Amino acid sequence: SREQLEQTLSEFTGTIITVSHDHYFLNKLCDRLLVFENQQIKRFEMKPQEYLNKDVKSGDRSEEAMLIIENKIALILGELSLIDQNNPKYYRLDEEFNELLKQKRNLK
Amino acid sequence: PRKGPVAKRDVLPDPIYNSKLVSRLINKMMIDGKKGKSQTILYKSFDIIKERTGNDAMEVFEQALKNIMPVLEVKARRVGGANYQVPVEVRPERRTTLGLRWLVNYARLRGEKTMEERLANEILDAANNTGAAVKKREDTHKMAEANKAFAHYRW
Amino acid sequence: KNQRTIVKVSGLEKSFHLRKVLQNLHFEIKNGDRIGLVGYNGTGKTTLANIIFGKITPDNGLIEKSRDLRMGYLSQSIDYEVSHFQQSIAEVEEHELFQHASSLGLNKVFDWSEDRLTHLSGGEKLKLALSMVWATKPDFLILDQPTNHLDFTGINWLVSELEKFHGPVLIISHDRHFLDKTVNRIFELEESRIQFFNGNYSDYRI
Amino acid sequence: NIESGIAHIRSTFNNTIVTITDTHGNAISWSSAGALGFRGSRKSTPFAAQMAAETAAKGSIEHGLKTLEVTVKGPGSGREAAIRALQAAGLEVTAIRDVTPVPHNGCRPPKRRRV
RNA sequence: UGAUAUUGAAUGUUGGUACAGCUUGUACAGGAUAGGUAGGAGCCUUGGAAACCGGAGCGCCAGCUUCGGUGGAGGCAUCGGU
Ligand SMILES: Nc1ncnc2c1ncn2[C@@H]1O[C@H](COP(=O)(O)OP(=O)(O)OP(=O)(O)O)[C@@H](O)[C@H]1O
């Protein structure tokens, strides 16, 4: 009965409001949340599973830096993987890589 | 285009808040060249922002955009059989463009009756970064981080 | 203390009208057994439990149990037990009950009005019902459909507490995950005949 | 509890395995792209090699290593990422040594793919 | 194929029983890791209190545990609150 209900509700094109503490059932069916917290109802535009596994945004103004710097490390690391150490281009990429790694340490 | 980068277009600062960002959002809200409607919507929204929060509307708006503007986006690249999403840094101008666009679009989808109210609520959510537009920014950052391996690829 | 058989069922038959529910069931519950009684709706799981508890007399068969055995029964009609909570305060040592209650998240149960106590959430009813059963210090636990209305909190509580419990536990549940944490044996009741599987519920499925 | 060890990096075209052993080759710990949940194409990428090296290193640091000798095998692209990742974990890398097996004209290779 | 008789000895490993010792005990608040019950206002103290350090086990990451070395007069409570 639960399996049949799950199949049917995934197809239903109308509005569904479900209360369940079976988070699996919720996570399969629901795409948005109304959370009852601290005597307030807040609407969140995310799945049940994502809301719980969130991580506070206390340093969300800094994650932007950690994201950009790390993505540069990935780009330079990728190129180095394809080039022999004997190519003069290797030297420049390695210096930048070590310098960028220092920045990563400073942000952490 | 192939020739090379093309001259971007300036906007005048809004008469009331003396802000180019406000003016740009007004253009993003405008439909069918009806700039009147969009200016009225925004000014009414900013009154709701000040009347609700009590803080200055501009400060709330600027705080909201900060939470919306993305830093890394993903660009698709067809590498043989499978298509790879390559993470790319977002130019400062593009950050502003995406922020205003995302804000406006998701604001239009909200459930309040009037756009000004809708827009106001959306900006407030972004101020606390819990709205739809915020979620969009989360998604792109997830995609970029997930496909971080392929950053090497690029044009 | 040991694994001495506490409940032994043999040739248990039970019918309603013309519908056979239980047909020739032989099983034993021993000390420390954490048994999941599974099976689809209407298979007789509650009927079986009530016969084990003694609410329903079987048509045939014998139920052997220690004469002094105390059987804590969570039951399904919580409404009746929770309505008697006012009566239970006089019969149960207040202290222990309230100690549990606070853990289950029902804070300051002492102060609740009879209005609220009649208007409870179905999840509150269960939390109050659970606390009551455990304060009675039963030697054998029967938990019909637990974790139905419980939140993350009450599920973590019911798990950590079941593990601690000394006597045997018979859990009637459809919740795969609750079974996959608390039980080591599955009793599958199908076509009025019980089949036995070792381990939790996931392996039972396989 | 041992300090000096060898880091065997097996970088193939499909996966990068990193085993960490003592100087006498007793396995302390190991990690591989597959072990970290990468699948298919992802395991090959040098990014995965980095993560594999880090995970192997952090497992070893419990036993208390400080200096590593690195040996690289196979034609994969992982070696540089895995080596830099080991340095970033804190363990100093004395020397890198390519020990990819080279036959002196031995066994017939498998037939060439017609892709 | 198993039990058992012919059929013995020593060791190691692993369960059950009885005894003894080491000990072991964290909801929240409360000063904090409060196992239950009983008496309970004195107890310990160069026969080493507190405090410092080292060692070790546990641990809910708060912390308690005891072998100890420095250390030398307090330390703990019923009262108080929780
Ligand atoms: N007193 C009764 N009189 C008649 N029929 C009954 C009686 N009790 C149960 N039944 C029926 O016999 C079967 C036994 O139901 P029972 O409550 O024992 O099942 P269950 O395993 O608890 O199911 P569910 O999980 O759906 O509660 C069902 O068909 C039920 O309708």
CB atoms within 10 A of CB C195: 12
Cα separation of C70 and C92, whole Å? 14
> Please, what sign has the CA dihedral across residues C97, C103, C105, C110?
positive
Residues 6+ apart with CB under 8 A from B124: B49, B52, B53, B60, B64
Kindly report the nearest CA distance between residue C138 and chain A, in angstroms. Answer: 28
Cα separation of B54 and B50, whole Å? 5
Query: Residues B120, B121, B123, CA angle at the centre, nearest 5°?
Result: 65
Instruction: Provide the experimental method for this PDB entry.
Output: cryo-EM
- Resolution of the model in angstroms: 2.9
Kindly report the nearest CA distance between residue D29 and chain A, in angstroms. Answer: 25
The A-side interface with C (CB below 8 A) comprises: 1-2, 21-22, 24
Strand E within 7 A of C103 CB: yes
Which nucleotides along chain E are within 7 A of a protein C-beta?
16-17, 27-28
Residues 6+ apart with CB under 8 A from C17: none
Residues 6+ apart with CB under 8 A from B131: A45, B106, B121, B122, B125
How far apart, in Å, are the Cα atoms of C109 and each of A57, C89, C158, D6?
Answer: 36, 11, 19, 63
Interface contact flag, B151 A75, Cβ < 8 Å: yes
DSSP state at residue C143: E
Strand E within 7 A of C99 CB: yes
Residues of A in contact with C149 (CB under 8 A): 21
The token pair at B103 is 């804000």
Nearest-by-Cβ selection for D80 from A74, A80, A101 = A80
Cα separation of D95 and D68, whole Å? 8
Cα separation of B17 and B57, whole Å? 10
Q: Are chains C and B touching, using the cut-off of 8 Å on CB pairs and a minimum of 3 such pairs? A: no
Strand E within 7 A of C160 CB: no
CB B130 within 8 A of CB A44: yes
